[PDB]
Amino acid sequence: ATAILRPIGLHVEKFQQTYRKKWRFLTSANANVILAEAASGERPARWALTTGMA
Amino acid sequence: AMYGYDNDNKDFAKKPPADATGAEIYLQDYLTIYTNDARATTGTKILAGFPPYK
């Protein structure tokens, strides 16, 4: 029995794209210093310890 | 210097915890050799000087 028609489904077309970038970053070596942050609104007063990793 | 102050201390911002930051800690206690001071000694004197600690 020859099949003139078959369930070929929908004609769905799928596209793929890729994006490449190269960046150069300069980061300073900050000291580890304790800074006082005042309370404001919902934020309570807290001590802050900075770190040099960007 | 190693473990910081308590959060309620006023000097809390002075010394951040080294155990948390990974910073260094200047050592200030050094070895000292001793010998007798014979200038004020009356009678017999010991004039041996310093031992060769090197």
XYZ file of N, CA and C in Angstrom:
324
model
N 0.827 -1.200 0.000
C 0.000 0.000 0.000
C 0.865 1.255 0.000
N 0.871 1.965 -1.125
C 1.664 3.181 -1.241
C 1.014 4.306 -0.444
N 1.839 5.137 0.187
C 1.356 6.257 0.982
C 1.583 7.556 0.219
N 0.500 8.147 -0.282
C 0.609 9.429 -0.969
C 0.884 10.553 0.025
N 0.335 10.451 1.234
C 0.531 11.442 2.280
C 1.066 10.768 3.536
N 1.855 11.513 4.298
C 2.428 11.037 5.546
C 2.378 12.162 6.567
N 2.349 11.829 7.861
C 2.325 12.869 8.907
C 3.669 13.577 9.051
N 3.933 14.521 8.146
C 5.190 15.262 8.176
C 5.214 16.337 9.249
N 4.080 16.616 9.886
C 4.058 17.585 10.962
C 4.111 19.023 10.469
N 4.544 19.900 11.369
C 4.634 21.322 11.075
C 5.962 21.663 10.414
N 6.008 22.846 9.802
C 7.246 23.393 9.251
C 7.876 24.368 10.247
N 8.617 23.800 11.197
C 9.263 24.607 12.222
C 10.722 24.829 11.849
N 11.133 26.093 11.804
C 12.501 26.470 11.476
C 13.190 26.991 12.728
N 14.352 26.424 13.042
C 15.099 26.764 14.244
C 16.407 27.442 13.860
N 16.676 28.591 14.470
C 17.887 29.356 14.217
C 18.770 29.368 15.457
N 20.079 29.293 15.233
C 21.061 29.333 16.305
C 22.059 30.448 16.033
N 22.343 31.244 17.060
C 23.284 32.348 16.957
C 24.230 32.327 18.148
N 25.462 32.765 17.912
C 26.490 32.833 18.942
C 27.139 34.209 18.912
N 27.512 34.711 20.085
C 28.101 36.034 20.230
C 29.396 35.930 21.023
N 30.467 36.504 20.485
C 31.780 36.455 21.108
C 32.291 37.863 21.376
N 32.876 38.048 22.556
C 33.501 39.307 22.931
C 34.783 39.018 23.696
N 35.725 39.955 23.623
C 36.964 39.875 24.385
C 37.209 41.212 25.066
N 37.293 41.190 26.392
C 37.430 42.396 27.193
C 38.732 42.360 27.978
N 39.293 43.542 28.213
C 40.485 43.707 29.035
C 40.116 44.578 30.225
N 40.307 44.051 31.430
C 39.873 44.713 32.651
C 41.063 45.004 33.553
N 41.060 46.193 34.148
C 42.054 46.601 35.128
C 41.373 46.774 36.479
N 41.859 46.048 37.482
C 41.297 46.089 38.824
C 42.367 46.530 39.811
N 42.009 47.474 40.677
C 42.932 47.961 41.691
C 42.947 47.022 42.890
N 44.058 47.037 43.627
C 44.231 46.181 44.801
C 43.859 46.965 46.061
N 42.562 46.968 46.355
C 42.065 47.694 47.514
C 42.501 47.019 48.809
N 42.684 47.832 49.843
C 43.009 47.314 51.161
C 41.758 46.788 51.855
N 41.967 45.901 52.824
C 40.874 45.367 53.634
C 40.656 46.308 54.812
N 39.639 47.160 54.705
C 39.361 48.187 55.699
C 37.905 48.077 56.126
N 37.664 48.250 57.423
C 36.319 48.224 57.985
C 35.713 49.613 57.855
N 34.536 49.688 57.239
C 33.823 50.940 57.045
C 32.457 50.862 57.708
N 32.053 51.966 58.330
C 30.770 52.041 59.014
C 29.699 52.535 58.051
N 28.623 51.766 57.923
C 27.486 52.126 57.086
C 26.301 52.441 57.988
N 25.775 53.656 57.869
C 24.694 54.095 58.735
C 23.375 53.438 58.339
N 22.493 53.298 59.327
C 21.176 52.731 59.077
C 20.316 53.709 58.286
N 19.530 53.172 57.356
C 18.648 53.998 56.535
C 17.456 53.156 56.115
N 16.268 53.542 56.563
C 15.069 52.792 56.225
C 15.131 51.385 56.783
N 14.838 50.403 55.931
C 14.877 49.006 56.343
C 16.290 48.516 56.629
N 17.305 49.193 56.108
C 18.684 48.769 56.321
C 19.134 49.111 57.735
N 19.580 48.140 58.527
C 20.136 48.457 59.846
C 21.585 48.907 59.734
N 22.085 49.472 60.831
C 23.488 49.858 60.890
C 24.368 48.617 60.831
N 25.438 48.687 60.043
C 26.280 47.520 59.833
C 27.718 47.949 59.588
N 28.645 47.070 59.958
C 30.048 47.246 59.618
C 30.348 46.559 58.294
N 31.153 47.224 57.467
C 31.460 46.769 56.119
C 32.956 46.545 55.983
N 33.333 45.375 55.474
C 34.726 45.011 55.240
C 34.947 44.932 53.735
N 35.691 45.892 53.194
C 35.948 45.942 51.764
C 36.931 44.850 51.360
N 36.850 44.430 50.098
C 37.803 43.465 49.576
C 38.182 43.873 48.158
N 39.405 43.527 47.764
C 39.960 43.968 46.504
C 39.550 43.208 45.263
N 38.717 42.173 45.360
C 38.337 41.436 44.160
C 37.165 42.130 43.477
N 37.370 42.531 42.228
C 36.328 43.127 41.409
C 35.471 42.029 40.798
N 44.607 41.669 67.056
C 44.872 41.814 65.628
C 44.382 40.601 64.850
N 44.543 39.405 65.418
C 44.125 38.191 64.722
C 42.609 38.122 64.573
N 41.872 38.361 65.660
C 40.449 38.048 65.692
C 39.525 39.256 65.783
N 40.037 40.475 65.658
C 39.188 41.650 65.668
C 38.596 41.937 67.041
N 37.768 42.977 67.079
C 37.055 43.356 68.288
C 35.629 42.810 68.267
N 34.897 43.096 69.340
C 33.468 42.822 69.367
C 32.716 43.864 68.547
N 31.534 43.476 68.063
C 30.751 44.364 67.213
C 30.280 45.614 67.944
N 30.172 45.568 69.271
C 29.733 46.722 70.043
C 30.873 47.652 70.438
N 32.120 47.270 70.178
C 33.263 48.083 70.565
C 33.397 49.293 69.649
N 33.803 50.424 70.232
C 34.003 51.631 69.437
C 35.239 51.523 68.553
N 36.253 50.779 68.996
C 37.466 50.586 68.214
C 37.344 49.462 67.195
N 36.121 49.030 66.875
C 35.937 47.896 65.976
C 36.478 48.182 64.582
N 36.412 49.437 64.136
C 36.861 49.773 62.791
C 38.378 49.857 62.682
N 39.098 49.776 63.802
C 40.544 49.966 63.760
C 41.258 48.735 63.217
N 40.974 47.560 63.776
C 41.719 46.343 63.459
C 40.773 45.296 62.881
N 40.721 45.160 61.554
C 39.888 44.116 60.963
C 40.420 42.739 61.309
N 39.551 41.730 61.380
C 40.011 40.381 61.735
C 40.943 39.818 60.673
N 42.174 39.509 61.087
C 43.126 38.897 60.168
C 42.696 37.493 59.776
N 42.025 36.775 60.678
C 41.527 35.445 60.341
C 40.478 35.514 59.239
N 39.810 36.660 59.102
C 38.810 36.812 58.052
C 39.431 37.367 56.776
N 40.313 38.361 56.904
C 40.832 39.040 55.721
C 41.974 38.281 55.055
N 42.813 37.596 55.829
C 44.024 37.014 55.296
C 45.205 37.955 55.231
N 45.077 39.138 55.820
C 46.176 40.097 55.837
C 47.339 39.626 56.701
N 48.370 40.456 56.813
C 49.533 40.090 57.616
C 49.455 40.684 59.009
N 50.360 40.263 59.884
C 50.376 40.779 61.244
C 51.803 41.102 61.646
N 52.112 42.385 61.808
C 53.486 42.750 62.123
C 53.888 42.187 63.481
N 54.961 41.399 63.501
C 55.509 40.880 64.746
C 56.496 41.880 65.329
N 56.395 42.108 66.640
C 57.183 43.140 67.300
C 57.986 42.626 68.488
N 57.961 41.327 68.762
C 58.670 40.758 69.903
C 59.867 39.982 69.368
N 61.065 40.381 69.788
C 62.310 39.858 69.247
C 63.203 39.341 70.365
N 64.132 38.459 70.003
C 65.027 37.859 70.983
C 66.068 38.868 71.457
N 66.486 38.728 72.713
C 67.507 39.580 73.301
C 68.404 38.734 74.188
N 69.705 38.777 73.905
C 70.720 38.131 74.721
C 71.075 39.079 75.861
N 71.527 38.523 76.981
C 71.849 39.326 78.150
C 73.227 38.966 78.683
N 73.858 39.949 79.324
C 75.109 39.718 80.029
C 75.180 40.669 81.214
N 76.036 40.336 82.176
C 76.129 41.129 83.393
C 76.784 42.477 83.116
N 76.328 43.503 83.836
C 76.914 44.840 83.754
C 77.853 45.016 84.944
N 79.152 44.901 84.662
C 80.159 44.909 85.717
C 80.601 46.311 86.112
N 80.037 47.358 85.504
C 80.476 48.714 85.815
C 80.231 49.071 87.276
N 79.074 48.694 87.822
C 78.760 49.017 89.208
C 79.128 47.901 90.177
N 79.649 46.782 89.682
C 79.974 45.657 90.548
C 81.129 46.014 91.478
N 80.986 45.665 92.753
C 82.016 45.901 93.757
C 82.635 44.573 94.172
N 83.963 44.525 94.202
C 84.666 43.302 94.534
C 85.072 42.517 93.304
N 84.920 41.196 93.356
C 85.222 40.372 92.195
C 84.222 40.647 91.077
N 84.696 40.531 89.840
C 83.891 40.825 88.665
C 83.949 39.662 87.690
N 82.853 39.454 86.969
C 82.798 38.501 85.868
C 82.830 39.297 84.572
N 83.914 39.150 83.812
C 84.127 39.909 82.587
C 84.094 39.002 81.361
N 83.159 38.051 81.339
C 83.125 37.069 80.263
C 82.546 37.644 78.975
N 81.647 38.616 79.072
C 81.000 39.163 77.893
C 79.818 38.315 77.450
N 79.411 38.531 76.202
C 78.304 37.769 75.646
C 78.769 36.380 75.208
N 77.914 35.373 75.344
C 78.214 34.060 74.770
C 78.062 34.090 73.261
N 78.775 33.225 72.540
C 78.640 33.172 71.073
C 77.340 32.505 70.636
N 76.245 33.269 70.689
C 74.936 32.690 70.405
C 74.756 32.387 68.923
N 75.607 32.951 68.062
C 75.508 32.657 66.637
C 75.836 31.203 66.328
